[PDB]
Amino acid sequence: HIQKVAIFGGTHGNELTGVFLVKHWLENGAEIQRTGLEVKPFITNPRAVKKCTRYIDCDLNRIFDLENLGKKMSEDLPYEVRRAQEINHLFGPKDSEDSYDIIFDLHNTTSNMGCTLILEDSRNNFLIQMFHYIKTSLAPLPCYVYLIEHPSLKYATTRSIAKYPVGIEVGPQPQGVLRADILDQMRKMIKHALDFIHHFNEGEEFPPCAIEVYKIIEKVDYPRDENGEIAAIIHPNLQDQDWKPLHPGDPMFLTLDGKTIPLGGDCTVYPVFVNEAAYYEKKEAFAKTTKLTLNAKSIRC
Amino acid sequence: HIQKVAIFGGTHGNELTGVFLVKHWLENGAEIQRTGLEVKPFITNPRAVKKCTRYIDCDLNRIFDLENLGKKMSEDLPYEVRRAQEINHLFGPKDSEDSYDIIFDLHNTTSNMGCTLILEDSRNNFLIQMFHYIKTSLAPLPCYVYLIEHPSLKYATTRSIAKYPVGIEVGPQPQGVLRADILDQMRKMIKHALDFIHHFNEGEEFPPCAIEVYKIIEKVDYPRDENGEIAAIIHPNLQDQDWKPLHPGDPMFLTLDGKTIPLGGDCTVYPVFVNEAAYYEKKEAFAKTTKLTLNAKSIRC
Ligand SMILES: CP(=O)(O)N[C@@H](CC(=O)O)C(=O)O
Ligand SMILES: CP(=O)(O)N[C@@H](CC(=O)O)C(=O)O
Ligand SMILES: [Zn+2]
Ligand SMILES: [Zn+2]
Numbered sequence: 001h002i003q004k005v006a007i008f009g010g011t012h013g014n015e016l017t018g019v020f021l022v023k024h025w026l027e028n029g030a031e032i033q034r035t036g037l038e039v040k041p042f043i044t045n046p047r048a049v050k051k052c053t054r055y056i057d058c059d060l061n062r063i064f065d066l067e068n069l070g071k072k073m074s075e076d077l078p079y080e081v082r083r084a085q086e087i088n089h090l091f092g093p094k095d096s097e098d099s100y101d102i103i104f105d106l107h108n109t110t111s112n113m114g115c116t117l118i119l120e121d122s123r124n125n126f127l128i129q130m131f132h133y134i135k136t137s138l139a140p141l142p143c144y145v146y147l148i149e150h151p152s153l154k155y156a157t158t159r160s161i162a163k164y165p166v167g168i169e170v171g172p173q174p175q176g177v178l179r180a181d182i183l184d185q186m187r188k189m190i191k192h193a194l195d196f197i198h199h200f201n202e203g204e205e206f207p208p209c210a211i212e213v214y215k216i217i218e219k220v221d222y223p224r225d226e227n228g229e230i231a232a233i234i235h236p237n238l239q240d241q242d243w244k245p246l247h248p249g250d251p252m253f254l255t256l257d258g259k260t261i262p263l264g265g266d267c268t269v270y271p272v273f274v275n276e277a278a279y280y281e282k283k284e285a286f287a288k289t290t291k292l293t294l295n296a297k298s299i300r301c
Numbered sequence: 302h303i304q305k306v307a308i309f310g311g312t313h314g315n316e317l318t319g320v321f322l323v324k325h326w327l328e329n330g331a332e333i334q335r336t337g338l339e340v341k342p343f344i345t346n347p348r349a350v351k352k353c354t355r356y357i358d359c360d361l362n363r364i365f366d367l368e369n370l371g372k373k374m375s376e377d378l379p380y381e382v383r384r385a386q387e388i389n390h391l392f393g394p395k396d397s398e399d400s401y402d403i404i405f406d407l408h409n410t411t412s413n414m415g416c417t418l419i420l421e422d423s424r425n426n427f428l429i430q431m432f433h434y435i436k437t438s439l440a441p442l443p444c445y446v447y448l449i450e451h452p453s454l455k456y457a458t459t460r461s462i463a464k465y466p467v468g469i470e471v472g473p474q475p476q477g478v479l480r481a482d483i484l485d486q487m488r489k490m491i492k493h494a495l496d497f498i499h500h501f502n503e504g505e506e507f508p509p510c511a512i513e514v515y516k517i518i519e520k521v522d523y524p525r526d527e528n529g530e531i532a533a534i535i536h537p538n539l540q541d542q543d544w545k546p547l548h549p550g551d552p553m554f555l556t557l558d559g560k561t562i563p564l565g566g567d568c569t570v571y572p573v574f575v576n577e578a579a580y581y582e583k584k585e586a587f588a589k590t591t592k593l594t595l596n597a598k599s600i601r602c
Pocket of ligand 2: 313316362408409410411419458468470577579
């Protein structure tokens, strides 16, 4: 049974859709309340939000792990590390039964990804059923599921605190910009997610369901010159073609001289986060993913 | 006769198309050289480029005036001030005959403005002729001219150093990103600008011409709180509709609730820089322009 729900906004301070909503919701939350459901809206990175930048000392959505949450409180720590602890204490602790049940973390991307749900665990049948529900509600408005569970990769998100972590990504949108159509898409996504929880809490039964997801394989950097500067850019056939298949023959990058660097490798892939501003400093031009199906067992409260 | 020509990129450090070309052209100018014409590429704000921020201490493209350029040099002064003077000493002095003849200043905008030329002087026959040549040469691809001449508004641009300052602005592109299609557009604009200069220098006579331009009337802020926080955002109809006519009854802003706030007044207007990331701090949702026609007298070298 689902009791404790939060919506985080402003994990990244220059992703204004979430910030705008949460800050309105703090003043009037009617939209995010249901019957017998209390959800708490919350500004994750208030300082980065004030400076309208992604972060102050380091990326908040990467540090919710033992290395960082186990450090001694201290004014000498990076701001985000201090803030990660404050959040763990408020909405976790992480890996405890006292933690929040569900956390929705709201994000924006410059990539042409549309409505996107981040899945941190392939086995969780509750999430697969939620995601199936939202996907289907939204349609024919498309909505895709990025699955980030992986051995060496995968990062400790802000929402990993909860038993049920949910990432909500909407793009394309420039950083520092509030576009109405994106705002609307993110509201519709939440509308359905919260509806599903309520529906489940009034003991509805959901049959088995399948969904298609995109599983991370590896991350590709920009081809780089002899000093570490970018020597080629996202080829225009690849620009804005997130989710769509890319075959070994196909064009990845383009040089100033007009030279085209093709995919190579062995098989088809589905690129994600194509040309995301914030990933330039992470050496990620885009991420390679395989398409695969996940099956959920029926569930009931 | 035109001798000294510069191309500035990186005036704003997170506008990467200019920075990316200029760094390449610094390593191989072939593309921007014309026979009998030497063109110097230059990075105006190398420091803001390092951090991929718009600026360090203040906006570089607003301070090339007497107040700042006449100041005594010291380390208490904002970086950009100290930097502006250093640029005046290399490509000016501004208002002197020893200054460069033409400076092209390269920019990107989040607004959906397409290929855009900034005209600083409505009576400058030479520029008007150049712009008409570029417009004509780019067709059917559109090209738009924004006349920032105004008694009160109008600011001291990096490029105002030259006898003939030219601003090149290409959108939409998110800050901190390199799109190929936007890059290609800026290169073509430059190709044709240099071609024009060369042709003129080889004595070709240019008959009189007319161009449509858009003259700044006034800037419009987002409607705000009692706290000064944004209370409404760019309406979906207005979004991405730069240059297109906006009538008095038409939707302008949108609340979460969401009520539409219409234009008001009684004259039609032409909106420019709709939803520009960098202008949120400047408190400009968009600029209202009136669209008029300018003539050039014929010219010859
Ligand atoms: C480009 P973003 O910061 O909105 N994407 C998230 C992805 C996620 O939510 O896991 C991140 O990089 O932290
Ligand atoms: C969107 P931008 O900052 O590159 N445009 C210039 C306008 C210009 O080039 O005059 C500015 O705001 O100073
Ligand atoms: Zn984010
Ligand atoms: Zn600029």
